[PDB]
Each structure stands twice: as structure tokens, then as C-alpha cells.
């Protein structure tokens, strides 16, 4: 089991196409926002407690029931059908605010075409005030109210926050980003025109880039001075920030965003072209390789954060303290800006980031394009053109508030209220349904007869008490402690919390809506109604 060769071969054949923004972009930002080091242990314990069991359960359901992400509940719970609509709303919100990162990255890619790097050019090229280009080439100490050139670039070109005084007053629309998101939507529309991808060819050509570019970025960050301060801060247990800090919510959000469960994507990817093919192992190796890639990304971010903090002679956890999604772009710009072939590496990294984000967002709409096929196979299954275009237009019209000058004022709100309580409560509802409403012993018998090997005893005790209690505790800690958002020199008002709670409620209130709508259809007393509705209908 150690250095036998088969394990390293299986990991080498899996590290190529097992990386998403949930572990290269979402993990470093969350880990650095709540303090590095003090997040790794809660993240990994919450993972090993309630991320692998739910992943395996969703995979087993998708492989056994052979139904979509919504039609699978017809055989599980006729009442718990609104969870499909909740998953659809969550995926719509994601595709609304997740494509803005791709828009920014593609604008960076377009701007990187010039032989001269605009990152190291804040000498009033277009307009930039109060910037310091030379870090150590001038032998001048860092002054008060000084920002990095890459920070000024990200704050004044791709996301013009100076036009909007705050979230209450959003500016106009940026045409340079509107055309970018339009091109991105045109590209994503020409890739889901068929909807079949299980043995494609593009997967290899998009997986061959990370295995090399991540390694070259890692060695570049390793051969960079001052990185010793960042590595020590990344491996700090920091037990003081674990007792009663309530950081487990962000850990669970990162886990459910990087692994896949909670968004209705494992069911779609499991209910096709697979039945009894090496179960109980593929999920584990996928989780392991995802955690490994996440740790590699965190390390390659922190080894550059260490240099950025050493070149300023200030604390590591203070350089980017009021920064949201700006942590990744500024870090990558400052890391690539110190390389011989900086422009080529920059354009290659931006292109691979674009194709990785595209391959990641291909899975978001995949679970919603096939959800209506297994639910309405008589009206939507014959068109295949009047539904994908409709959902693309709806996403374009729903992703316009995140394209204004106050971009980060909306992305930061949807980064902790659209997937924080929503995905968590959806996973909790699904787990408690599969546990109590359907029966643990029944599902155990099904997986035993479809696999030939009953799961371990540790897995049976998980889905009954481990995951539901932990998710309930996380939800209670979130409700009894409203977060405090704070961008660069900005504080969110009191109505922002109400807006976030309303956003995190519309994606969940549909389940009680369907619950109240289901009982008023069938006649009879309440007891007979629940008795006849709990039991699934004939397949």
C-alpha cells in the first residue's frame, strides 16, 4: 500500500483532469480570508467527516437508480421533489456569478497580448495614482497608503470600483466586460450543443497543461526569496482560532464547492454509461486527488504571498486583508512578473485557466439541461434548441448585475449567501431524506446487491448521525452569527445582511412550497395522505 507502484500510477493518471476552481481559486481565497494555517485542519476534518460519505452516497444513487437529478426522487420521495428546483436555482446563481471570474481572466488574457506587461506599468500609462513599481530596486521603505501596481490594475481596469461609491449606488455597464462575457457565453453555447462527453478528445489536451504549468509555477515560487515566511504561516495549527470561531461554515462551503455534491452534478455524471464499475474506490481516489491538488494550489499561493510580504517588511496575514476575489489575480500577476519569459508563461497560464473554468462550468449546466429531459420527455426532449438557448438568455440577463462597476460588491455577497446556507441545507435535506425517509438498511441492501460488497461499518454510522448533526450545527452557527463583509475601505450596511438572507432563502423556500402543494392534491385524511405519499409509486 506504500510505494507499490499501482497507487502512484493511479494518482499520476488522475492528477491531469481533477482540478477545478473549487480547489485552485476558491480554496486559497477562503483559506487566506479566515487566516492561513488555522483553516487547513478544520477543512480536512469537516471533509473526512461529511464530504466523502455524501459524495459516495450521491454516486451510488446515480449509479443504481439510473435517473436524473430531479426524477430520481420519484423513486425516493414524491414529496421531496422541490430539491430539484432548489438545485436548479443554485446552479443558475452559480452560472450567474461564477462566469465573472472567467470574464476577468479572459480580459487579463486579452491584455497580456502586449509585449510590455501592464502590471509593472503604473507610470500613468492610462491612469494610475499613488503606486510603487520598484519593490527592492529603489531601496526605499514602504510608505503609508501605498498599493501594489497589480492591485491598482485590478482595482481600476478590470473592476472599476471608483465609479460606484458603494453597493447602494451601482454605476453603468462596462462594454469591455460585456463583450467578454458575450464571447464566453457564445463559446459555452457551442460546447453543450450535443450534450455527450464521456470519452472526448479535448479532455486530454486541456489536462496536459496543468500537470506542467502547476509544477513550473511551484518551482518558480520555491526559488523565490522570502517564501520561507509564507510556508511557516501555512503550516501553523493555530488551535486558538478553532475552538469557538465558527469557521467550519467556510470549510464546508469550500468542500461542497470543490467536491461536487450539493449542486446536483454527481447525479447527472453518474446516471449515464456506467453500472457496477469499480465502486467505493473511484470516489475515494477522486476526493484524495482533489484534496492533493487543493493543497498544491494553497502552497503555490502561499509561497508567493510570503515573497509579497517579505518585500514589504510587514505581516503575512495583513497584505491582503480587505481583499475578496482579488487575492488570486494579484498573486499570479506578481508571481509571473518576475520571470524571463514572463509574457509567454502569463498567456499560457491565462489560457489554461480559461479552459479549466470552461470545463468546470460545463458541469454546472449539465445537471440542469438533463433535469428537464427526465421530467418532461414529451415537450422539451424533442426541441433540444429552444431550452438551452432559453437558459443561456436567462443566465445572461441574470448575470448583468455582476457586470456593473460595482462588481466585487455583488460577487462577495453571492459568495457567502448563495452557496453558504443554500448548498448546506440542500445537502442536509438530501442526507436526512435518504437516511430516514428511504431507510439506511434498504439503501445498504441495494448497494450490496448492486456492488457485491457491503460498505463498512463506519459508513453506516455516518449518514445517520455524523453528517446531519454537523450540518445542523453549522446552520445554527450561521443563523446565530451574521457574517461581516468588508471590502477595500468599505463596510456593508445593515440591509446587506437582509438582502443576503433573502437571497439564501428564495433558493430554499421552494421545497416547503412544493411540500404544501403536494398535500393539497391527494384527497383523504392527513394520515392516509402521508402514508400514501411517503411510499414511492410503481416504477
Amino acid at each position, epitope marked *: 500500500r506504500e510505494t507499490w507502484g499501482k497507487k502512484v500510477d493511479f494518482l499520476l493518471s488522475v492528477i491531469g483532469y481533477a482540478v477545478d476552481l473549487g480547489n485552485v481559486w476558491r480554496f486559497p481565497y477562503i483559506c487566506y480570508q479566515n487566516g492561513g494555517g488555522a483553516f487547513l485542519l478544520p477543512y480536512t476534518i469537516m471533509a473526512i467527516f461529511g464530504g466523502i460519505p455524501l459524495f459516495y452516497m450521491e454516486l451510488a444513487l446515480g449509479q443504481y437508480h439510473r435517473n436524473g437529478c430531479i426524477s430520481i426522487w420519484r423513486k425516493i420521495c414524491p414529496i421531496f421533489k422541490g430539491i430539484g428546483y432548489a438545485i436548479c436555482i443554485i446552479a443558475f446563481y452559480i452560472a450567474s456569478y461564477y462566469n465573472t471570474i472567467m470574464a476577468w481572466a479572459l480580459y487579463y488574457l486579452i491584455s497580456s497580448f502586449t509585449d*510590455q506587461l501592464p502590471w509593472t*506599468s*503604473c*507610470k*500613468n*500609462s*492610462w*491612469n*494610475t*495614482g*499613488n*503606486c510603487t*513599481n520598484y519593490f527592492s530596486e529603489d531601496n526605499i521603505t514602504w510608505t503609508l497608503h501605498s498599493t501594489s501596481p497589480a492591485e491598482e490594475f485590478y482595482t*481600476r481596469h478590470v473592476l*472599476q470600483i*471608483h*465609479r460606484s461609491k458603494g453597493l447602494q449606488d451601482l454605476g453603468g455597464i462596462s462594454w469591455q466586460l460585456a463583450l467578454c462575457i458575450m464571447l464566453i457565453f457564445t463559446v459555452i453555447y457551442f460546447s453543450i450543443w450535443k450534450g455527450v462527453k464521456t470519452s472526448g478528445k479535448v479532455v486530454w489536451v486541456t489536462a496536459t497543461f496543468p500537470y506542467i504549468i502547476l509544477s513550473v509555477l511551484l518551482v518558480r515560487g520555491a526559488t523565490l526569496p522570502g517564501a520561507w515566511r509564507g510556508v511557516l504561516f501555512y503550516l501553523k495549527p493555530n488551535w486558538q482560532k478553532l475552538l469557538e470561531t465558527g469557521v467550519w461554515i467556510d470549510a464546508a462551503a469550500q468542500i461542497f464547492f470543490s467536491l461536487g455534491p450539493g449542486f446536483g452534478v454527481l447525479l447527472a455524471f453518474a446516471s449515464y454509461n456506467k453500472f457496477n464499475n469499480n465502486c467505493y474506490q473511484d470516489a475515494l481516489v477522486t476526493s484524495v486527488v482533489n484534496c492533493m491538488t487543493s493543497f498544491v494550489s494553497g502552497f503555490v499561493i502561499f509561497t508567493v504571498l510570503g515573497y509579497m510580504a517579505e518585500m514589504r517588511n510587514e505581516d503575512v496575514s495583513e497584505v491582503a486583508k480587505d481583499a475578496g476575489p482579488s487575492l488570486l489575480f494579484i498573486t499570479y500577476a506578481e508571481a509571473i512578473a518576475n520571470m524571463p519569459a514572463s509574457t509567454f508563461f502569463a498567456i499560457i497560464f491565462f489560457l489554461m485557466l480559461i479552459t479549466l473554468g470552461l470545463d468546470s462550468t460545463f458541469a454546472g449546466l449539465e445537471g440542469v439541461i438533463t433535469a428537464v429531459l427526465d421530467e418532461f420527455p414529451h415537450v422539451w426532449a424533442k426541441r433540444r434548441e429552444r431550452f438551452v438557448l432559453a437558459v443561456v438568455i436567462t443566465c445572461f440577463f441574470g448575470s448583468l448585475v455582476t457586470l456593473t462597476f460595482g462588481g466585487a460588491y455583488v460577487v462577495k455577497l453571492l459568495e457567502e449567501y448563495a452557496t453558504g446556507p443554500a448548498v448546506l441545507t440542500v445537502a442536509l435535506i438530501e442526507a436526512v431524506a435518504v437516511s430516514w425517509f428511504y431507510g439506511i438498511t434498504q439503501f445498504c441492501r441495494d448497494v450490496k446487491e448492486m456492488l457485491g460488497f457491503s460498505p463498512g461499518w463506519f459508513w453506516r454510522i455516518c449518514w445517520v448521525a455524523i453528517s446531519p448533526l454537523f450540518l445542523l450545527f453549522i446552520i445554527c452557527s450561521f443563523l446565530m452569527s451574521p457574517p461581516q463583509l468588508r471590502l477595500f475601505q468599505y463596510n456593508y450596511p445593515y440591509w446587506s445582511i437582509i438582502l443576503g438572507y433573502c437571497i439564501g432563502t428564495s433558493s430554499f423556500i421552494c421545497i416547503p412550497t412544493y411540500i404544501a402543494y403536494r398535500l393539497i392534491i391527494t384527497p383523504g385524511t392527513f394520515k392516509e395522505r402521508i402514508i400514501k405519499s411517503i411510499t414511492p409509486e410503481t416504477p
Partner: antibody
Amino acid sequence: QVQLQQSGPELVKLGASVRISCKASGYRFSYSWMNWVKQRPGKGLEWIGRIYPGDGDTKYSGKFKGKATLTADKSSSTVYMQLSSLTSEDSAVYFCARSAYGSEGFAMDYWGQGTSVT
Amino acid sequence: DIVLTQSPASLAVSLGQRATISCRASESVDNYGISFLNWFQQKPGQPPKLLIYAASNQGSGVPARFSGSGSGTYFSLNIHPMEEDDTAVYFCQQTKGVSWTFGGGTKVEI
């Protein structure tokens, strides 16, 4: 206060070359632009080019792309402009318009006395 | 090379009167909300000093007698409390991209 001095009067020589010294003091030298405008006697004004101290960028208008060069020097905090092929109508004065610190984009009054050539 | 020429050519000096100067920038549009335009003042035998920058703010060491407004293409200048001591020539400069070029200029004389 930011001091700014220039060279003295010179003579126009056909086909020869001249150098105009312009040293800044009392401000961040290699952090802002350094324009070079031309003021004909009695006539209007015109732009020649700009250079950032530090060999970063070197732009021009289009009518003096080859007849006027720009050279920076971060050591002595001076900026030179070596002319070439002086003509009869080029007899005018030149200033050192220090550009603003970015977003504003103006000249913060630091205009030299001007070097006249005849 | 975005050319920019002023429409007026010469005005008259009068105590307490309105006089505006316009700048033709039809082939120009605001870039990042800040009007990349400047206003200078050149007296006979004196280097031009800053008068008004960004067409909205007041220059360094300039009295409140001068004030400018406008956005986009047309820009004006309010010099209502004008006296004999302001008998200089004013220009117009735009700073959008690499197109820095001055204007024709306007003089005042009674």
C-alpha cells in the same frame, strides 16, 4: 516646493545638434512623466514627445519622431533632449512639463524658464 | 493623434461678464469617468501655468474666479469675475491615449 531649472540661451546651427539640460529636484524623479512642449515666438503651441525617467516608455507626436530624441538618467535626476538637423523655423523655446501623478494627468505648475535658441 | 481645436478666436475684456471657451473633441469619449482635459494660461513673457485640470477641479494656487464644467465632448469655462489682470491666452489639452496635443488658443483684448 519642487525646484526645476533648465539650460541657457543657445544658437541655431544648420545641420548640427544641441543638448538641453533639465534637472528636477525636490520630488520623486523616476515616478512621473516629463513632457517637452514647444512654443514658437508669437505663434501657437505644439507637442514634441514624452519620456518616463527609467527607460520605461518613450512616446512621440509624429512630426518629431526622428528629429528629436529623449534620454533619461536616474543617477543625477536629469533629463536631456538632443536635437538633430536644426532648421530655420525651429527657433523657439522648450519647457519641462512635469506630468501629474496619474489619474489627473496635468502639469503641476513646474514649468521651467525655457531655453531660447536663435 | 486626436486633434482638438477651439471654436472661438478672440473675445473682449469687460468687468463682470460671461465668456466661455469650447473645445472640439468629437473624435473622443470619456475613458474612466475622469475627463482627460486640461486648461492652461500663458501670459506674454511667462511660462504657462496650470489653471484647471480634469475640467472639474481647481488648479494649484488658482483663485475661485475660474471654474469649468462639462463632460463628454463639449467643455466650457466660467470666468464671470474677470478683470484686466487676466488678459492672457488660454489653451485646451486632451490626454486620452498617446494623443497629447495642444489647441489653437484664444486671446482677450478690448
